[PDB]
Symmetry: C3
Subunit: 225 residues, 3 copies
């Protein structure tokens, strides 16, 4: 009767429960025990972006790239490899210009020229966004109220945290990520696979990521010999 169907549904739900829980456990294990060698730190990136947040955001972009190259030679992509690529993730749409990426860190310019919003993703990485222009509304898990952030502010999405994110048209920011960067890739690509079907954008995305990894390997080789 209804009791048997309730029992069966409960058994299936418990199966899904243990699957999802062990997936979370494996994410934690891969992340906490991942290597932690860092070229940048989030305070450096945030201070650099905040200093230029009063400029036009594209002038700021350029000045930030020049300063990052000056202070971290061999770790920022060259001009020929810079490209704006759409990012469809968690139900929102923006675009990125990747400057640096390794297994443990990334640096990029991010933003959107449309009003958009959705899920932030949940992964073993600490992400920080410093607003150059626009507005960034963040809604944290377990609460019924959200906060707006403005140019000059830095939002820190912490390890294992999930939020709702919402950007107004014309919102541009500098983003630094630290942790187990591969664990973000799935989230970064899901809407491309299951929603937009935009395989040229996927091509561009994996292309620039591979170029950033190759730059880091080349610099590591040149500095060890």
């Amino acid at each position: 009767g209804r009791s048997v169907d309730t029992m069966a549904l409960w058994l299936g739900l418990r199966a899904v429960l243990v699957v999802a829980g062990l997936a979370v456990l494996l994410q934690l294990i891969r992340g906490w025990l991942s290597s932690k060698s860092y070229v940048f730190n989030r305070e450096e990136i945030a201070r650099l972006a905040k200093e230029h947040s009063g400029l036009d955001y594209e002038v700021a972009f350029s000045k930030i790239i020049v300063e990052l190259r000056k202070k971290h030679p061999g770790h920022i992509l060259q001009d020929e490899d810079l490209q704006w690529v759409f990012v469809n993730a968690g139900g929102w749409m923006g675009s990125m210009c990747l400057l640096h990426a390794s297994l443990t860190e990334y640096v990029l310019l991010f933003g959107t020229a449309v009003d958009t919003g959705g899920h932030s993703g949940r992964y073993w990485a600490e992400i920080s966004d410093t607003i150059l222009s626009g507005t960034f509304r963040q809604w944290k898990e377990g609460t019924t109220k959200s906060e707006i952030f403005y140019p000059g502010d830095t939002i820190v999405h912490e390890v294992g945290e999930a939020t709702s994110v919402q950007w107004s048209s014309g919102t541009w920011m500098v983003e630094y990520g630290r942790g187990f960067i591969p664990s973000t890739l799935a989230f970064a690509l899901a809407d491309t696979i299951f929603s937009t079907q935009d395989f040229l954008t996927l091509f561009y995305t994996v292309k620039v990521y591979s170029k950033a990894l190759l730059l880091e390997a080349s610099t590591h080789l040149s500095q060890l010999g």
Copy 2:
């Protein structure tokens, strides 16, 4: 030539047509013949929520939970099992606090602190939402115009109906569902599987559902002996 390719495409479309049609038919068969034993009714929930819709929505939440426990002992989750869980479904993002769930009914608090919107889902269940705060825009199938609803109003999403739904930031409501509740689960989880990749949220969701089912079974056992 083009005639043969047109014929082939038409054949494939007819295949998809009969597949989708028989899926709809099976949904109807599972739903209409599902059991219909009810602890609540939608008018009771709607009147209770409308009475408190002039309060702050969190005060209303608390008073509604207390009254539901008083009038339906053994059918509302205890305080230790109440939790705000994100809900990513149909392209929109909100959050729920489940109070009751069985095979045939559910009761929850729902809302969002971001502007969001998307598909309502289509399933064999009658859903009713009573607005405590915010605005709820509903766009029904087969029409070119939408309607806004305000605090104190109840929206009834009827069995087999599909709509577009849109909520402004700070919109909170009391939701009651009646029908074949499992048939909603797929819709409730799809964006988590194929968009957000947030497996800890999936864990939380199946956890609270399983707790609600266990409460209902425990109460059924205590009342039959």
Copy 3:
């Protein structure tokens, strides 16, 4: 160590790269070499829609359908086969009324009664939208700025181009598509498969497409004999 994991990740990224690149190449090959026999042209559709864009959009809809039937008998669906069907694609939600479809062309009425937005899709087809009412914000790839278009304006989404699109509530337009129309179908259906789970909407969609193809075949047969 970290060097080996970096190498492995780079190898996997290169695999994804060549897969996506050859998918794009196959899309280009199927599209460029597809047949190019056309019943309409985009200037005709755009001029007809622009002429009536000062009317109420539903009066415009009707007058446009009457004129299209008068000028292209046997290529527009009859009244009994006209239906508003929800379209969930690329993270946005609208609705369409298909008037014409073949392997190489389509004509439909499109719009939304909710604020929505997302990815435009990327396929080997040239799409043109003439706004009857509302606003259409378009954000092109490789730029950090978007443009708003108003009633009477035509937006041309070109072959292989990807954009972000955003419509305000009450935005209605006339859409003409030219190219390899099947290559759009995946994008048109993805959110239904992986997000909304709305199989009755999928039924309606493949039903009207099949009816349009059958009309075109019937007219081709009646005109060749």
